[PDB]
Structure formats: C-alpha cells, structure tokens
Design a protein around this nucleic acid. Sequence first.
RNA 1: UGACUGCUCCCUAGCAUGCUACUACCG
RNA 2: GCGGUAGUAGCAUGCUAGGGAGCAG
Lengths: 586, 296, 618, 187
Amino acid sequence: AVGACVLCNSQTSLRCGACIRRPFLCCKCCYDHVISTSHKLVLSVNPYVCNAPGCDVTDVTQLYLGGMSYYCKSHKPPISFPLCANGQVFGLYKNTCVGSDNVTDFNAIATCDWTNAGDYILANTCTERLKLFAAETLKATEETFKLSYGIATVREVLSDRELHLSWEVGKPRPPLNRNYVFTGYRVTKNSKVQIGEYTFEKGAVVYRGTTTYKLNVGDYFVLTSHTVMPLSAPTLVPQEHYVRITGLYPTLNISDEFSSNVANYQKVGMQKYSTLQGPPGTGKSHFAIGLALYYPSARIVYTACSHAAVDALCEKALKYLPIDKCSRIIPAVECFDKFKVNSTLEQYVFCTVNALPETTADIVVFDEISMATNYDLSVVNARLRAKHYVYIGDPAQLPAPRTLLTKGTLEPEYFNSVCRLMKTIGPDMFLGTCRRCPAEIVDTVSALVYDNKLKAHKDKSAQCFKMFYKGVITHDVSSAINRPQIGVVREFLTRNPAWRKAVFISPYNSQNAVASKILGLPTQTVDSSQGSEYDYVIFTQTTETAHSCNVNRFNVAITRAKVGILCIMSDRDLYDKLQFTSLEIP
Amino acid sequence: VGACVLCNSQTSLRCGACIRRPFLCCKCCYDHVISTSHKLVLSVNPYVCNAPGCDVTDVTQLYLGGMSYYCKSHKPPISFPLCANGQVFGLYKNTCVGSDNVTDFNAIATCDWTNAGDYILANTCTERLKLFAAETLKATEETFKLSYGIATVREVLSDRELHLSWEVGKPRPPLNRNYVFTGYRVTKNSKVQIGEYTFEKGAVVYRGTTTYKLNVGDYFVLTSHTVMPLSAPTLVPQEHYVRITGLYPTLNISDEFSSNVANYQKVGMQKYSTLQGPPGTGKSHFAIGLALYYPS
Amino acid sequence: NFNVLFSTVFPPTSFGPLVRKIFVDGVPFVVSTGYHFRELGVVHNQDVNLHSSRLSFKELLVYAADPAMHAASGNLLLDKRTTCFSVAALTNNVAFQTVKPGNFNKDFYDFAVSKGFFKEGSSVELKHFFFAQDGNAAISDYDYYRYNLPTMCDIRQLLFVVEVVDKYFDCYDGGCINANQVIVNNLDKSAGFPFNKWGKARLYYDSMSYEDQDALFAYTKRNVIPTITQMNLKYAISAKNRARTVAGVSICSTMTNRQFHQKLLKSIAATRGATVVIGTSKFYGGWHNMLKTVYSDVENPHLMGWDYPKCDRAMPNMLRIMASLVLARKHTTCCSLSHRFYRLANECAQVLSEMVMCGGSLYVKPGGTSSGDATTAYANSVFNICQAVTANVNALLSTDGNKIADKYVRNLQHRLYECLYRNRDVDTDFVNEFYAYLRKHFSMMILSDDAVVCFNSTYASQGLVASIKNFKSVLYYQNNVFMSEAKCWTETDLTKGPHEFCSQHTMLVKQGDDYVYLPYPDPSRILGAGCFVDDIVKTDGTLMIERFVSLAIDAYPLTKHPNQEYADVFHLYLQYIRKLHDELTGHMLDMYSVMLTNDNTSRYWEPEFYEAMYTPHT
Amino acid sequence: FSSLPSYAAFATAQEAYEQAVANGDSEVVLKKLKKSLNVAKSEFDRDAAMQRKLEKMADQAMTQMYKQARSEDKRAKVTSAMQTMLFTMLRKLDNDALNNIINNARDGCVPLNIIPLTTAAKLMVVIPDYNTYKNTCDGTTFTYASALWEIQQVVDADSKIVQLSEISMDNSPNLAWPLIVTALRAN
RNA sequence: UGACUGCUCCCUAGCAUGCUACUACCG
RNA sequence: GCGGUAGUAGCAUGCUAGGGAGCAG
Ligand SMILES: [Zn+2]
Ligand SMILES: [Zn+2]
Ligand SMILES: [Zn+2]
C-alpha cells in the first residue's frame, strides 16, 4: 500500500481520499493540498477519522492522535498529539520527502472539475506526470458524466429499425449515435444476459446497429462504464534522431509507386516519434503500407482509436502487403479478421488498443489522432515499445466529443500532445501526394488552415455549388431538425439529378433519419466517417451553432466528396472567404 | 575473522567503500577510513540501525544499545556511540596496533588504478600490502573489461562475415587479439554456448576456436570469474645455498649450449634465477640443457 | 457402526470426495462438493456457487488446499510396494528420502572417560543413538497401516461406556471462541502441503484478518473441505531403529480446529487433581502430588501400567469418532446441531481418512489417528479411558454371579445387565452409581496414554474389576492387536512408586525431614544425550553452555540414588560446566584484553541451585 | 530537549540569578533567585518531561504501522502466486475424455479416485523386485485399468536409464531396485 | 523435508506496583 | 514544624511480548 507521490516522487503512503482516484501524496505536499482546498480526508494504511465509538469528524488538521486510535477534540485521552503539524502530516517516511513549489497545478486539477476548455488548457499545460494523472481523473469525470444517463430499456419490440425504448426515471436520455456505442443486456430473473452492441437512433426507435439479436421485453441497453486504469507509461516518449538508421535494416530496391514516402520512411528510420502532415485521404493508407515493404524486416503495429477506423488500413493490407505475416486481434464489436487471431510474433500486426496484449516492436503507426485522448496515447505507450513511432492523420480535423466542455472551444493543438507538437516543433513529416481532392479544396485547405503545403491537385469538374441563404432553426431534446433546410433539400435538388443519388450529411442525424422518409439519402454522422465517405455527397447546415460554425468542421466536410457536394454554408462564419458560383433559389 | 594487512592483528571489520572490502582492524580500521572516503563498515553483521524501515549509512552516526544497533533518529537513548575514542568498536577491541603509514596503505587501496602513479604507489608498499595492491589491480582491470557489450549476431552471413550489433549503447571493445569473444547461444531459457570465438573487423570477421556455426540473436562476451587472494612471496626467500647439495649432479652435459652450465652452476646455488636474456639467446635452450645437467 | 460393516461389500474406488466441473469467470475447474465416508454415508455441500466472476481470498485458499485439482491433474500411479490404495502422482520422478546419523561430541567423551566411565562391566552403558535409515524408509513405514482393519464395535455397550467416559470429563467447560482470543505458540512451523512453498504459518496468520478467519470458521460449519497432509521423518535420539513418522496437517485445518476446541483444551491444561494429568508439572513437588492423588484411598492397592502396541495406526475408527463426540458435547448453546454435524464430518474428512502425501505422490490413509492434528493428546486420553471402562464392564459381567459374596456388587451386576442390554435410553442415576464405585476401586491417572491404575486388589483377584488378562482380551477383539504380557508391570508395593510412567522411575527420597517422590530418568539416556548431537554447533560446548544446565536439571535426582555410578553422572555434569566456563572466560580474555568481572555464575556449578527445583515452593 | 518554549523563561531567570550572584546583594536577592529558579524548573517539570513521552508514543505507533504495511504487501504476493499456480495447473486437465465422463453422470458428481484412473494419459508404476516385475509390466505392453498401456522407458533409484533387455534373473542383482516404469496410454 | 500439546531454565525489552533516596513547591 | 504533590535516580515484585535451549507423549 506504499508508493511514490504523484508530485514529489518521494516515497510515501498518503492518499487524498477527497479526490475521486485517490492519488499518493507525499507528506509535505499532502499538507500543501489539504491547506488551500476542501480536501479534508487523507487515508494512509487506515482512514484518518476519529474512530471514537460513534464519532464522525473527518479532518486531518482537526484530528488528534490518541493512544492508538484517532481522535479530534472531544475524544482524545490526556495523552494526545497534533496530527497536523510542522507543515508535515504524520505519515511514513516523514524524514524523506522533497516537497515541491509546484502545488497550485495539483490544487487546480483537484479543484477543476472538467467543464470548460480552460480545463483542457490545464490538461495539456502541466507536467507529464500531472497531465497523466489529469487525463486519468478526466476519464473518472467522464464515467460519472455518461453513466449519469438513463438505461435504454426497450420494453416492446415493434419490428426492425423501430422499437419501444424506455429508460430509468429522470436519469437523462443520451443524444444520438456514434459517441454512444451502446451494448444492451436482457433480464432473466436473478441475472442478466447478452443482447448486442448497437448504435442508437430515435423513431418507435429506429436503429442502425453494430450487432443483432432477437430483441424481446424489458430489453435494457447501456453505455457500459469501465474502470480507467492507471497510466503507468507516458503518452509519448522523448525522441532523438539517430546517427544511423539503426534498429532498422536499409533497403536498396523499393517500389516507387510511393515517391515521397520512402523519403519519409528514411527520416522515421532515424527518429523515434514522428507524424505526417497529410490532408484527409492522401495515401497514408498507402504510406505505411509501402513502408511495410520498404524495410522488409521490421515489426510494425497498425492501430487507430476505433476498430471501424482501421477499415482502409485493413483493406489494402492483404492486397499490397503479403498475406502471411499479417495479424490483427478481434475481441469476441466484430472487426476485420482478414488477418489472424492470436499471433503476436508476426512481422506485420494490426489492431486497436481496446483489445491487444502487452508487446514490443520497432515502428508504430496510429491513425485517428485528431480525436485522440492523452489517456489513449498513454495506453499505447504502455502496451508496446518500439524504436520509431508514427501517428497518422492531421491535427486540423474533428476532435472527439469533449462533452464536458460546455463553454469555450478546445483548440486543435490543444487536443493531445502531438497536436501542440506539430505546430511549435512543427510537422515531423507530411504527405503532399494528395491523391484525393480537385483544385478547389486543395488550395482552400492550404491557404485556409493547412499551412500552404498542398498545391492544386486535379481539375475543377464543377458540382459543389453554394448560396447566400438563411434557414430557420429548431431544436428538441439534444438534436436539431431544420424544416427551413429539409424543404431546401428538394428546393436545391430541383435543377440537376447529379444531386439525388448521393448521401445527406447532417450535424444531428435526426434530421436525416426523418428526411430520408421524404427522399431517402443515408444517415451519416459527421464524427468518424472520414475514409467511409462518398466521392459525391450532399451536406446541409441544419444548425447555425459552433458545432457547425468553427473553422475545422467544414474541412472535414468538403474534403469528403470528389468534386461534388451541396455546400449550403448559410451559417454565419465561413462564407465570403471561399468562392463558388451562387445559383439562386429556383 | 582474519588479520588486517598492516597490523598482524586478527580483526573482524570490513571497510565499506572499497574493492573486495578488505579486512581492517579497529583502530587501524579507523586510520584507513578517517583518512579517505570510506563511510560504512561491515563485520559479522553490517553496521546499520535495525530499527524497522530505518535508513542509516555512516557508522559514526550509529550507537549500539540492546542486542542490536540503532541510530540517532531512531535509537533508544541508552546509547554507546560506536565511532568513539578514535577506535570503532568491534572484536579484538584492545589488541590492535594501528598505524600512521596508512594514507600510503590507503593510497594503495585508494588509488583508482587510473594512474601510472597508482602503479608507483603499488611500488610503494610491502608484501601483504603489495599482494593487496596486485589483487586490487586485477579487480579494477576486470571491472573495466566488463564495461563493453554482448556481441549479439542476429543475421548470419558467411563464415567470418555477419550482421552484428550489440545490446544497448554499451561501448565497443578494442577488437584485437585481447578479447576472445566467446558466444553463449539461446535456445529456450538459458544462455548456453555459441562457443569460444575471436572477433575482428569484417560482414564481421570472427575466428572460431572450435568449429562452430552461428545462430540468431545469440551473442558473445568474455565472462569473468573470481581472482582470489594469495599467500607466499612473489619473489621467494632469496637464499643462494652454501652449496648445491642434495641433488644428482650428473657429469654428462649436452654441450651444444656452451653458455648453459655457465649459469646452471650459479642457479643450482641460488633459489630464484630471474635473468636478463634476449630472445632466442640460449634460454629456450637453457632449461632443456639443464634437463641434461639435471635429469633428476 | 452399521455403515462400517455394510461398507466393506462395496468397491473402494468410489469413496472419497465428489467433484463437479464448475465454471469460474467462464473457465472450468473441478472442485470438491461433498464426501462419501465409509461411515457417515453421503454428505453434500451446502454453499456451492455454480458460477463466479471473481474468487476472493478465503476462496483461493479453500480451492488450493484441495486434493481435487492436484489429483484430477496428475499422472496415474500404481504402487506395488504397499497394499494401501494409491491414487495419483504429481512429479515425474519419485523422491527417496533418507535420515543421517548423529554427530559425535568428542570432548565430552574424553572428559567422560577420564572420570572413569565406560569401564567394561559398568552399569551405565551407551544405548540411545541416532539411528540412520536408507532410501525407501518413508514408505516402508507408511505401510504399517495394513494393521488397521474395518472393525464393527459392539453397540449396546458402547452406548454406555460413552456415558461413563463423559461423566469423567464433566468438571470442565468449553465452547466456541472468536478469532481474537485464540493462542498460538511458535508461529514459524510449517503449513502443510499446498502452502509450504510460500512460508510458515505466520504468513497465513497475518494476511487473513479477523473477520476473514471468522467467515472461514463459520463457513465450514455448513460445508466439507477435504485436505492433504505431508508425512515426515523424525530425527531424534532413540533406542530402536524403526524410524518415526509424524503427519504435518495443512493450515486450514488447524486454523479452525483451534477456534473450535481451544477453550476446552486450555481448560484441561489448567486443572489440578483430576484424572487426566496433562499440564501438571513434575517440578517443585508436583510429581509427589500426582502420585498421592492416585493412591487416593483404595483399600489394598497395587499398581498396573500397560501399553498398546502400535497405538496410532491400529486404532479403529469408531473409537476415533466416539472421541470427537465426547470432545464436542459441550456446545449445547454455542452451536446448534447441523452445525455440530458438519463440524464432526469436517474432522473425519481431515484426520481419519485424508490423502496422505507420503513422498511425491498422494495416497489414501485407511483410518487410525494422525498424530499431528490439533487435538491428539486429548483424543488419545479419552480413547484410553474408553478401554479402561470397557475392560471393567467385561470383567464385571463375565463372572459367575452365584459365588459373589457381597450384596452390593451382586446388584451392581444385575442392574448393569439390565441397563446395558434390556434398555435403549439413558439412566443417569445408575451411571452415577457406577462411576462412584469405579472411582472407589480403580483410581487412574492418564497422560496421553501412559497410564497408571492403583486398583484395589482383593477384588481384582475375584474378578470384580479389571486385571490385565482383561485388557488382553479387550485389546484383542476390539482393537486387533495382541498385548504381549511382557510390557505390563505390577508393583505390589507402594513405598516405591510406579515402575515407570512417562518413562521415569520413582524414588522415595527423604529430603528436608520428610519423604517425597523425586522422579529420575535413565542414566544411559542422559549420557547419550550428552554425547550425540545434531548439527556442528551443538557439538562445540562453549557456545551452548545452556544445554548442560538443563541436562543437569534433569539429572539431579540421581544424586540421592543408592547405586553409585549414577551419582557420578551428576557430578560429571557439574564439573563439566565448570570446565566449560572457566576455560571460556580466560580464552576470551586473551584475544580480548579483559573478560568476566561480575559473576554469580558460580551458582551453576554447585547443587544448591539445582536443588530448588524439587522442593515445593514456587 | 534543547529548544522548548519555557526554556527561554528558564534562561532569562537563571541568567538573572547569576547576574545577582555577580552583584551579590541582599538576602531577598536569595528569595528571588530561589523562587524564580524553583518555579522556572517547575516549568521543565512538564515541558521536557511530557513531550519526551509524546515522542515515545509517536515513533512507536509509526513503527507499528510500518510493520502493518509490510504484512499487507505480503498478502498480495501470496495471492498472486496461488492464483497463477491454479491458472497454470488447470490447463493440463485434459479437457476431453473428462468432458465426456462428467456429462454422463447422474449430476456432475463423480468420485475423485476415478478421474485419473480413467482419464489420465500416463501411467507410472513402481516395482520392488524382479519376481513381481514379471507378473505385471513385462514385455513392451501390459494392461491395467483395462486400457492398453505400452512401456516406453524405465529408470531406477539413481534415476538413469536401463534397456528392457537387461531385467532378467541373472542381471537382476545389479539393478538399483525399485525400478520405476513410465508407460503411456495406447488406444 | 522440520506436526500438535504440555512443563522448565537462561538473556534482552516494556508496563504496573511497591520499595527507595535527593531535590522541590504548598499548607 | 507535619503533611501535600511533582520531577530524579535505586531495588524488588508481577505481567507482557520477542529470543536461545532442554525434556515428555
Ligand atoms: Zn590494523
Ligand atoms: Zn537508524
Ligand atoms: Zn461451537
């Protein structure tokens, strides 16, 4: 029950039980945090409480050692002792502790309850140790936030994609789908049984799930909690460029289907942590894929934050790469097993941290970084060890549902570490072979945010059109339908059929699940569909809020298509900065 | 339970920061430690406060007491400070002589074996102390010779050419004939036998002592052992006998070596013949012509 | 009793535990869930959980102290050395274990001959040595169980001998205690099979808190836990070469038999003046008071030791049960009933039929006491009183009651038959009448089976009480051994005490101005223990002047003896301590430069110290 | 013990007493010096006389809780070991023939002393001497428990190997005799 | 590899009690 | 003057715990 303190590294045994996670506190710093805060319980190999017969008082400062129990004022026998004293609460190794001027940060994170972006300014802005402990408490705040939601109990089963779904009393109903990968269970009598993992929509509750069942009565569904576990390893390792490409074996011949990809395999062969500044969809799914053949003797680990994000990485694997030495574990959501189950020692390996054993490699690929948490990166650095490391994507995309943010926005470079690292240390790498987008959005990203490194890719083939419209908003529980946009659907779908055979992007897919009853374009969540997008789509603003009105939501919205999607950017931020033709209402 | 090296006194202490941690004697121990950086002493048990979880390193700070040792920040008051009276308490507490010639004694032990001056200082002592200096020499050598890596060959190439690396960072050896870099292969759990080799520059040229093959991830060192203390004098008790008596002085000598008996007669009347003779100068012939001057 | 008979007929590969594959965290094990004894029929567990996501600590324990996992995962075994039904095997190489010889202690030997001991012809002569044993001694000693047969015991007289034994054990008191009042001396003694790879009883007496041990002990009062048991070779001086072997039960058997029995146990080992004499010192004039209680008043006494040949392996199983049913008759309130039964059954499953692990290879142990549990030395005592009473009932019925002269033992035998056979329920009136007669003409005194019995005589010469042909009969037909009438003495005199009890004769010396019964040992024993030690540290004497003091404390009453060379043993010991000291002192003076200055060690080598311990005052 | 509160009162009062001995005035100076001293010593009567028992109590309780943290780590070590032993000793349970012989019983309950006797996949038989060796494990196969066993190696006391050629009557009394035969289950 | 239980000696530690003197301070 | 109580040693008794060793079944 002993260990280092979360601030002084000083071997101790005090546990600030007033927090949620109970960190280990050095004596002196245990003082420092008990003083200027309401942390008024500290546990050692016991709890500090006047265990008089029927007392209750819980204050370290206020408690007096009495004989062998503990006492406050009205309990101590004549022989007593100020527990609080000397600026050093009474715990083991009272004579070995370094203290630390750095205490206001701890007081903060203990006091800061994760509600604004300033909270995340904190999380990114402290010590590796302290942001690590932070991220852990962050996840604690999240498990108390989200399991504070109702229990999706379908009492009646109507059909397919429509159910009578109920909850517990008062405990709120979640919003929509992707941030809410549900997993329901059914009663038996004394215990529970499996049901399936779903994604939840309204009606009657229409659904489009990840698993199935024979759904019955009382069928309750939850966003099951877990236990965020300690983050022993850091999030990232401090790198160095090596004098040689050691640990890796140079190749001489190489397929130059990937030109400026060997030029970066070379620099990562000599540097540990690294990442490309390559726009959405630019052959990263060809980059590390060609790398796998580049050094035909290296251990690569393929990962992202979501098992359904490793789609592209999993497709062309068994195409480009050889079929034998590739591997990816699938936990019993069902994921891509076109590799193999349980086979760590295979030169090529894939999967996502949600399920994979402890290991060690040489090169590391990690997609899905803009929506990453420092908690995850920590997991990664804890699950494996390698010589060089590559994180895939770009920061300037969408971040994960930072849901406890209810005010100021979180800036991109402030998402996780690499985020602040790719603009101030700069891009370790970058992809410019931007085989995806035409001439519009390439220069648009370049002179918009994406630091003018991407040139005009291919031709302006004319399909994305834009207006100067308005559109009236309406809300409900935690989503938005927009009749002054659901009418505009057909109102624009009038003049050319090259619109009708598309998809209907939406901020809150209630609008799509309803307007598909009119037409029938697919329900798509804007969150994590990058790489699972069509070359020709339709988008409608539906809402004029920051969830739509930022600067980075539309760069993950106009990148998706090839040369065609309805850009109704009637929202009041980004309009008279990009240029299109303005076809009036007809 | 033996003697310090300059007091012919059985003692039982053992200096803290040294090489082998040598035997020292109460007062003599003091004259070793208090004149250098030695800050702990070991006995039948080591001298450290056995108040549970305590942490005490300098002998001075401790105190005896009940059937144990203690310390200022932990002791019972009924102390008895050890490092007292100029003589740290331990068995043979009385019969000890100590010495002032210790910073030379120490110099011999407190020479980091970096200097040719340290060699002069090893040249600056006597028999107990000189055998001591020699063993300290050997030990410092050996603790430096194990400062390199373990020559792991991962990819086999031709005989006397491979793709060799190492462990991590640990420095590169003077790869000449000094190091017989012998291999210990790994099969399942144990480090066992690539064999005895000798590595040179390749593609890495080795020299397989016995006929050997190479594997994968299996590596090469020169694993050390235990140089031990000695006894009798390096130079014998020199005494040129009054005569060459008690041997079989045969008459018939192979005279091909006409400088051989010209010294055989002086050696048969002399314990130690440590001679100056240039290479191939009737020396390799010397002892084997003695084999006829003395076949018995 | 009946089941003991009707259970020979069935096969013997169908006794022992049961099992059943349970699934913990979606993984299957095997776990015991009952038992099948040869007597108590089938017995089903009561708290079996067909699933579990996580096992705690009490669990982990009671699953790693079980045979089922080890056996059910091990290579079969056929053992052609024994007859005992082997079971399984764990290792791949069986292990053969041996016993070394003693160590000679020379300096005591030369010093012993200097004073003129060991003159060929003397009356003291070396005899107790450290005997060696070869390889397969462990198992050729385990084998001796084949002297243990299934026995039916007569019943309409066992259900009366059990009243009278209970009446003996009546002045005492006992009950369940809690996990904070148990007392356990010497906390670094081994923990038995599955656990002794990790540490001594200490470590499992810490990690388990107080409410743990209470959950555990009030748990196995509705369950059954089969257990293993090592087997060990003693290493100690002796007069015979057949090695001795002692069974080291595993922790979770003691760690509950304690809390169960402790109070009755420690309330026998603290009463003076009864029948059992466990816990009564012989020093400071205790021995005299023993031998003067025994001779309570019986009109024309004698004495009458005896001994059971192979006592702990030839014991039937009905008598071990009866022992436990008299040691657990006090809980009329602390425990209910099915609680008392699952406790008895837990005893029988642990120390009357367990799975001896003699070697590297489980076996099966048919019956008879295991002499290393947590209630031997009293179980044996109550079994012993059992044999004494039933010898009395045989001796009293089987008499031609037409020649009996009195008119009170005539009616005693009449109603003894009535209440014995023609009755079904108790009669505590007559149990009391008997036990009164029996303690007026047959006083006893009983350690852990070395008895003494100052019977009236002119009865036992007309067969109105036991004799020793009667213990012969009873041992024969109810224990199946032949008690050779050549280890059973009979002092016809009392001014000399008992020829031997606890292996110590008894001399009526005249000290102070009055007469006491000091108890002396066996000169060869004391000498032998002087000369032969285990370990080379026992040897050197100066380090261990603390043995010779005790040995001299035990070798004192020899000084008053009539024969000579005896007394010289004592004086040898005194002069030897003196030499040891006054040599150590100077010896340490030289290499020092001082030594001993404050003495009154001089009390160690004069007899007025050693004499205090045999005069009544402390 | 040299820095307590009332120490200052004592210091001033008795430095003043010595200043009065430096002047050497009245006998009422003695009245002062003898009521001040005794009262100032009546101070330390309590200061360095109670806090010295407080330090006893303090360091004592501290060492007790040190010992307790030790015991509590030991609990964790033993649990981890017991657990890994179970979860490595289960894997050889042979989960097939077992699976059959259970799922046929009246209800899961099948006395233990038959699980090895019908599902174990290796015999080990110990023989004392030759004359008994013949009447069982002779040749290269025998049968016992009515499955067909086939010898495959033989050791002895000293744990070495003998070839089944050697166990006659003549070469018998050179065999460390409790030969230990290690068969296999043949179908 | 080192079983349960009982009695006994010897050396430390701690508590209590008393015994104890020398100092105090008050009446 | 006599007692008060408080600190300081000193002795004895007893109880506690930990250590070493001996004997009996
Ligand atoms: Zn010296
Ligand atoms: Zn200390
Ligand atoms: Zn009870």
